[PDB]
């Protein structure tokens, strides 16, 4: 749903984000 923001730090850094990430994609805080 939402292209992997370049900002990857935040949740995206965080394994168990990657579960719920595919429908709970917030907007990329870069």
Not at 5 to 13: F, G, H, Q
């Amino acid at each position: 749903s939402c292209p992997p923001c370049p900002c990857t730090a935040w949740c995206l850094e965080r394994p168990t984000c990657l579960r719920l990430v595919w429908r709970f994609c917030p907007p990329c805080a870069c």
